Structure 1
Amino acid sequence: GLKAAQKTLFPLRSIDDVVRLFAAELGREEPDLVLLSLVLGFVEHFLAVNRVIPTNVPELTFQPSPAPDPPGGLTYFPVADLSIIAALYARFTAQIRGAVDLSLYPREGGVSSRELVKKVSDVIWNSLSRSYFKDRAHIQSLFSFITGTKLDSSGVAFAVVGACQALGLRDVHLALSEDHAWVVFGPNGEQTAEVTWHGKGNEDRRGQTVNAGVAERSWLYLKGSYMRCDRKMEVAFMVCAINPSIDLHTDSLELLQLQQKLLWLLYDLGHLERYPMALGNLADLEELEPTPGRPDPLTLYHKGIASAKTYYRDEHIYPYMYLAGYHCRNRNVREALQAWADTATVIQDYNYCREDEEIYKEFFEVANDVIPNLLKEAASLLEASALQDPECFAHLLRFYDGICKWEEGSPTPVLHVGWATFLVQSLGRFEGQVRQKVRIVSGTVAGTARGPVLTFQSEKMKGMKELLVATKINSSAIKLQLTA
């Protein structure tokens, strides 16, 4: 069951009570992923999923507390009894140990066999409802798995890792790219296995190694530069997986505070160190309700970016989109365009393919909708500035440069006539005066001995560096140049 050192922290009657359980558990050698998820799923349940308080359950109670700001009010918190949580912990533990016989598998000196890993995978896989939409909120925790039998894509891989911990396996860890999750194991942890589906269509890639996706240079596996989690990072994941969202437009104030505090907790113990996405997540949270005494969002986005550069060969994309998004919100045109340019710079070394849909859509919305709506806006301030800055126009070409370089060597075409119309319209938003102060040099002298400058890496963009910097924009020719 639960060790007595865990039990004494119960019951939790507030957010602060929960943070304590998390600090306590993070100081152990083997943080209890199962215990922690169950608490998170339990508290998310009554704060996001069923905010209506039950009236005929003598077991479940709620804790009254002083309202946050002027509005209201008494905020009620779902008190997590020990008996409730212990029963859930117990049922999960039973399920697994029941279904698998560690006798049929000899652990070779702290080494879990691959047949063992597939087995634990199946146990989870075969345990989940056939009947549900996998694309909704509040089905990430083990609370969800044990209660309703529903788990979203990434949640399955977390479930498989928590289940291995329940069996005392300690070499099976969570592998984590930016839009997919799987498992790493073996001695020194260079064995991998798919354990969940990905995307809209459920193509089960499970049982397979990951080598194929690393090889195809797809953004899903990050050229082999994905995160290999330790127990402490798996706790950070959980905290990120917290979903404060009640409605499409409404969010739970306590679930936001909880995720915020838990992220700070992690930050301080140096656990966000290697987790760019957690850093940006935390940054976004700070922008909404800054806690006094702490660093700026902008600081944090850069830590995230720093982390990506140090630990993952600057091969990640979200840390920039986090930043870009920030500026795009505070209407900082130049910093937006720069950060988007940096994003494309990272993507240029990838190939595009079917399963990279999540990121394709992001470049598409940025290129076709978010940049145009943002230029058009500034087209109206100087009419009563950035539309008069060659750095921004250069930031923009660097953007379409990275995207053209993406398309290169890729199975499916990235560009089509739909991208062209808005490239044409975005350029046109700049004065010939301005477009011309930018010089597209090839590189004068390679190496070193003892307006602004821009150099293209893609054939398309350099093939037409003349039409871009012209005075009439040849709409028709620029369009023919983006296809091949």
Structure 2
Amino acid sequence: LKAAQKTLFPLRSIDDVVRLFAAELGREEPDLVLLSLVLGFVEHFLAVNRVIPSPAPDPPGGLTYFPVADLSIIAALYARFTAQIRGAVDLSLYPREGGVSSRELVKKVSDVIWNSLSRSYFKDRAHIQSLFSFITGTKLDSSGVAFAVVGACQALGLRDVHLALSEDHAWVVFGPNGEQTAEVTWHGKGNEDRRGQTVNAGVAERSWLYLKGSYMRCDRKMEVAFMVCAINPSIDLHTDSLELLQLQQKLLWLLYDLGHLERYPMALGNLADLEELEPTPGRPDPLTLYHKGIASAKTYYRDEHIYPYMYLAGYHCRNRNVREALQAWADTATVIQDYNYCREDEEIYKEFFEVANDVIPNLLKEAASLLEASALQDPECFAHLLRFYDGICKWEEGSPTPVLHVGWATFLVQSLGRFEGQVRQKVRIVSGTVGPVLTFQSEKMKGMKELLVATKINSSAIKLQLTA
């Protein structure tokens, strides 16, 4: 460690950590191994191992604390990690070809990391994301392995190796222009031995997992941003650390300012979420951020991301804004329609499944409930519903893995049924194969163009055509 790094210790508050980050984000190459270790300590001591009549016998408004991270302690771990790597990778053996790293060099560093993790631990477990987990607990989650491979590679001065993130996966980029791709970790319930391979199969397969190639490739600073997103404030299932929430917000705002969330639509959503809980005065209102997130995706990722829209759908949902909610979840469908469902897309299916068969059925349930003594009379809100299912039907077309079945059918019908026939009527539907006017891309929906507007819903026959 350098003098400037050491001076900023000990860390005795949340702002001391922002300083370290601010100090460390000023430098060409920020120290990832230092910043994941510090985040790891504080999270472990604020979430993994929490310590928690007049006068009340306990502080009646609650209590918040900071674990003092001492230089003594952190440097111990930093020296551990660096010793471990430098020890088990001999750079003399891999010809560094002028500023550029070998696939053989990356696979090596990945193996060192991979071979250091414990034989046996539940991988879905929380608070194993940091390098602190890796060093003091010899455990990392899927994406945590990827980070450590990049953290490790930084320590060996492989400036060209960097983190790649989709919406549900992490791997590495090296070589000339970040052109070279390598898998360094696993995915889902037991599956991914893909380790060492190129990503080109998964980009061409058209799987949501690899975003048809519109994935994030991080400069060192975007790697820091990730680190901060990966901060996990949950203590148990009922409660969150008010400390780790305040820390993620202050550090996301720092990285926002320094322009390091420009190409990070998820981080931007995370911050809109934190702003919604606890607005920091001065700053953008959540919706602005929610939109800066969609902007990002349309601009730097060909509008091939789903979360930016999910993030927004949710704000409006929570804010009982029924139209804008359905409008967003519609944009969601319209983005996934141009994809395919594949083995390791399990995660985004879970989420579409949830809105189609829980969230929307309940917003509309509640919406219908407020009629009895509006959204359900607006034929646009209805057209957002239809543009949603149409996007999901198209997704499925060509996909190896069927999507819609039995369960989806009952809930479509319940959803369809919240809108009067006189309302649904006004939505003009053209069926382009080659009141609101709406186009359908999906053969399933064009296969009920005149059933979805019928005054009597032929529930039975819809369930039929929605599921073969």
TM-score by length of 2: 0.97
Q: 1:56 corresponds to which residue?
A: none
Q: How many Å apart are 1:132 and its aligned residue?
A: 0.8
- 1:372-405: CA deviation from partner (whole Å, max 9, x where unpaired): 1111111111111111110010000000000000
Give the conservation status (yes or no) of the 8 Å contact 1:175–1:227: yes
Q: 1:61 corresponds to which residue?
A: none
Give the conservation status (yes or no) of the 8 Å contact 1:67–1:74: no
Q: 1:296 to 1:84 in 2, by over 3 A?
A: same
2-structure distance, mates of 1:444, 1:165: 51
Give the conservation status (yes or no) of the 8 Å contact 2:64–2:243: no
What secondary structure is seen at the aligned counterpart in 2 of 1:175? strand
1-structure distance, mates of 2:136, 2:271: 29
1-structure distance, mates of 2:241, 2:62: 15
Give the conservation status (yes or no) of the 8 Å contact 1:67–1:75: no
- 1:172-200: CA deviation from partner (whole Å, max 9, x where unpaired): 00000000000001111110110000011
What number of residue pairs does the alignment pair up? Answer: 468
Q: 2:450 corresponds to which residue?
A: 466
1-structure distance, mates of 2:110, 2:84: 13
Q: How many Å apart are 1:75 and its aligned residue?
A: 3.6
- 1:65-110: CA deviation from partner (whole Å, max 9, x where unpaired): 9999995466431111101011000000000010010110110001
What secondary structure is seen at the aligned counterpart in 2 of 1:239? helix
2-structure distance, mates of 1:301, 1:473: 36
What secondary structure is seen at the aligned counterpart in 1 of 2:255? helix
Unaligned runs of 5+ in 2: none
Give the conservation status (yes or no) of the 8 Å contact 1:134–1:152: yes
Give the conservation status (yes or no) of the 8 Å contact 2:225–2:255: yes
Q: How many Å apart are 1:442 and its aligned residue?
A: 4.0
Give the conservation status (yes or no) of the 8 Å contact 1:66–1:75: no
- 1:30-50: CA deviation from partner (whole Å, max 9, x where unpaired): 100000000000000110011
Q: 1:12 to 1:67 in 2, by over 3 A?
A: farther
Q: 2:322 aligns with which of 316, 333, 340?
A: 333
2-structure distance, mates of 1:228, 1:444: 36
Q: How many Å apart are 1:483 and its aligned residue?
A: 3.0
Give the conservation status (yes or no) of the 8 Å contact 1:65–1:76: no
Give the conservation status (yes or no) of the 8 Å contact 2:47–2:234: yes
Unaligned runs of 5+ in 1: 54-63, 446-450
Q: 1:379 to 1:265 in 2, by over 3 A?
A: same
Q: CA RMSD in A?
A: 2.6
What secondary structure is seen at the aligned counterpart in 2 of 1:192? strand
Give the conservation status (yes or no) of the 8 Å contact 2:164–2:172: yes
Give the conservation status (yes or no) of the 8 Å contact 1:66–1:73: no
Give the conservation status (yes or no) of the 8 Å contact 1:275–1:307: yes
Q: How many Å apart are 1:27 and its aligned residue?
A: 0.6
What secondary structure is seen at the aligned counterpart in 2 of 1:106? coil
Tell which deviates more after alignment, 472-481 or 41-50: 472-481
Q: 1:46 to 1:397 in 2, by over 3 A?
A: same
Q: How many Å apart are 1:164 and its aligned residue?
A: 0.1
2-structure distance, mates of 1:67, 1:260: 32
- 1:264-299: CA deviation from partner (whole Å, max 9, x where unpaired): 001111111110000000000010011111110011
Q: How many Å apart are 1:425 and its aligned residue?
A: 1.3
- 1:290-323: CA deviation from partner (whole Å, max 9, x where unpaired): 1111110011000000000100001100001000
TM-score by length of 1: 0.94
Q: 1:241 to 1:65 in 2, by over 3 A?
A: farther
What secondary structure is seen at the aligned counterpart in 2 of 1:131? coil
What secondary structure is seen at the aligned counterpart in 1 of 2:261? coil
2-structure distance, mates of 1:298, 1:90: 43
Q: 1:222 to 1:144 in 2, by over 3 A?
A: same
Q: 1:350 to 1:69 in 2, by over 3 A?
A: farther
Q: 1:256 to 1:29 in 2, by over 3 A?
A: same
1-structure distance, mates of 2:452, 2:180: 48
What secondary structure is seen at the aligned counterpart in 2 of 1:47? helix
Give the conservation status (yes or no) of the 8 Å contact 1:439–1:452: yes
1-structure distance, mates of 2:281, 2:192: 46
What secondary structure is seen at the aligned counterpart in 2 of 1:174? strand
2-structure distance, mates of 1:236, 1:41: 15
Give the conservation status (yes or no) of the 8 Å contact 1:67–1:73: no
Give the conservation status (yes or no) of the 8 Å contact 1:440–1:454: yes
Q: How many Å apart are 1:429 and its aligned residue?
A: 1.3
What secondary structure is seen at the aligned counterpart in 2 of 1:454? strand
Q: 1:243 to 1:160 in 2, by over 3 A?
A: same
1-structure distance, mates of 2:285, 2:313: 15
Q: 1:354 to 1:73 in 2, by over 3 A?
A: closer
1-structure distance, mates of 2:350, 2:25: 37
Q: How many Å apart are 1:413 and its aligned residue?
A: 1.2
Q: 1:476 to 1:68 in 2, by over 3 A?
A: farther
2-structure distance, mates of 1:51, 1:381: 43
Q: How many Å apart are 1:444 and its aligned residue?
A: 12
1-structure distance, mates of 2:150, 2:57: 37
Q: 1:74 to 1:352 in 2, by over 3 A?
A: closer
Q: 2:176 corresponds to which residue?
A: 187
2-structure distance, mates of 1:388, 1:347: 28
- 1:425-458: CA deviation from partner (whole Å, max 9, x where unpaired): 111111000010110024699xxxxx11111111
